[PDB]
From a paper:
For this bacterium, Feo is the primary system that transports Fe2+ into the cytosol. FeoA and FeoC are known to be small (ca. 7–10 kDa) cytosolic proteins, while FeoB is a large (ca. 80–100 kDa) polytopic transmembrane protein that contains an N-terminal soluble G-protein-like domain termed NFeoB. The status of GTP and GDP bound to the NFeoB region is hypothesized to control the opening and closing of the FeoB pore and therefore the translocation of Fe2+ into the bacterial cytosol.
Despite extensive fine screening and testing of multiple conditions, we were only able to generate datasets of GDP-bound VcNFeoB(His)6 that diffracted modestly, but completely, to 4.2 Å resolution in the C121 space group consistent with 4 molecules in the asymmetric unit (ASU). Using molecular replacement with our 2.3 Å apo VcNFeoB structure coupled with strongly restrained refinement approaches, we built a model that clearly displayed GDP in the nucleotide-binding pocket of all molecules in the ASU based on omit maps. The crystal structure of VcNFeoB(His)6 bound to GDP reveals multiple amino acids that contribute to nucleotide binding. In the absence of nucleotide, the binding pocket is fairly open, while binding of GDP elicits a contraction surrounding the nucleobase with the associated amino acids responsible for nucleotide recognition coming together. In this structure, the Switch I loop that is important for GTP hydrolysis is mostly disordered, which may be attributed to the flexibility of this region when GDP is bound. As the nucleobase enters the binding pocket, a region of random coil from Asn119 to Asp122 tightens, and both residues (conserved amongst NFeoBs) become within hydrogen-bonding distance (3.5 and 2.8 Å, respectively) of the guanine purine. Underneath the guanine purine is Lys120, also conserved in many NFeoBs, which appears to prop up the hydrolyzed nucleotide in the binding pocket; electrostatic contributions from this residue are not observed in our structure, and in some NFeoBs (like those in S. thermophilus, K. pneumoniae, E. coli and Gallionella capsiferriformans, and Thermotoga maritima) this residue corresponds to a non-polar amino acid, either a Met or an Ala. Interestingly, Asn150 is positioned along a region of random coil (known as the G5 motif) above the guanine purine but turned towards, and tightly hydrogen bonded with Asp122 on the G4 motif (2.3 Å distance). While the general NFeoB G-protein-like fold is conserved in our structures, the GDP-bound WT VcNFeoB(His)6 structure revealed interactions between Asn150 (G5 motif) and Asp122 (G4 motif) that caused Asp122 to decrease the number of interactions it makes with the guanine nucleobase.
Author numbering: 1 to 25, 35 to 65, 70 to 261
The structure:
């Protein structure tokens, strides 16, 4: 059997380091490669470093493209453990999609020297997805991680969405626009949210009728949408990074 695997992650979180650790040492930095383990093939794509699933540089749009449309049997989220409260922002955006997800915490060797120990399971409950801590430069933990991934892929990932409620005013707006994306390849909720935030990427697949139905909905949120969404996301991220984080 074959497995499409997308390693998306924050820039300088060790994403290319891990890619070369697993496989081996089209213009843009979309580096693909295959390895095999126990009779099952993998197709690893290195999605360029991004902080958000929205649009920016060009590489941003490039990476955002494959996040939403590529067939991916699993999405490995490469997150640097040293700076968690930033890197969890994109991890927060990825869980909304309901795509098969892992949170691979990297630089655990460097995090360990900081006297920062993390409640990886209290973190795991907040996110509702497997959280795997490792050092990518330690190729013993990479050899073991190959087995960790292959078992996860075969059994499937059990996922619970993240309890982000954005205020009942926004939730009413979301539940009106979810009909449009009910079938879609990712969560209808995330696409309705990203349409309310007015992502040009999302609106492209919307007709004039649907575009101007969403355009209506934006002027219904009498509080600034972009400001509101970040406020709720900070609310969740901060109460997360206080609970799971121990420093000595
Ligand atoms: N101390 C430490 N440094 C790491 C670890 N993993 C990656 N790095 C560093 O992260 C740097 C950049 O990673 P890179 O492969 O460029 O990731 P990308 O920028 O997301 O593609 C490398 O030069 C490594 O030195 C780790 O486990 N421990
Ligand atoms: Mg606006």
């Amino acid at each position: 059997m074959k497995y499409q695997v997308l390693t998306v992650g924050n820039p300088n979180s060790g994403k290319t380091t891990l890619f070369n650790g697993l496989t081996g040492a089209v213009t843009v930095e979309k580096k693909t490669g295959s390895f095999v383990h126990a009779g099952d093939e993998f197709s690893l794509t290195d999605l360029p470093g991004i902080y958000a699933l929205d649009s920016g540089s060009i590489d941003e749009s490039i990476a955002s493209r494959a996040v939403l449309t590529h067939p991916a049997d699993v999405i490995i989220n490469v997150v640097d453990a040293t700076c968690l409260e930033r890197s969890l922002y994109m991890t927060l955006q990825l869980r909304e999609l309901r795509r098969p997800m892992i949170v691979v915490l990297n630089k655990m060797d460097a995090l360990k020297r900081e006297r920062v120990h993390l409640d990886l399971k209290q973190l795991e409950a907040f996110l509702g997805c497997p959280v795997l801590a490792l050092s990518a430069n330690n190729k013993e933990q990479v050899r073991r991680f190959k087995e960790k991934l292959h078992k996860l892929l075969v059994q499937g990932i059990a996922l619970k969405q993240i309890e982000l409620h954005y205020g009942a005013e926004f939730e009413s707006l979301i539940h009106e626009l979810e009909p449009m994306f009910a079938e879609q390849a990712v969560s209808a909720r995330a696409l309705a949210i990203r349409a309310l935030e007015n992502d040009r990427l999302v609106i492209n697949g919307l007709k004039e009728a649907e575009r101007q139905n969403v355009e209506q909905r934006q002027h219904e949120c009498q509080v600034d949408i972009d400001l509101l969404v970040a406020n709720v996301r900070y609310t969740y991220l901060h109460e997360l990074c206080t609970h799971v984080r121990r420093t000595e």
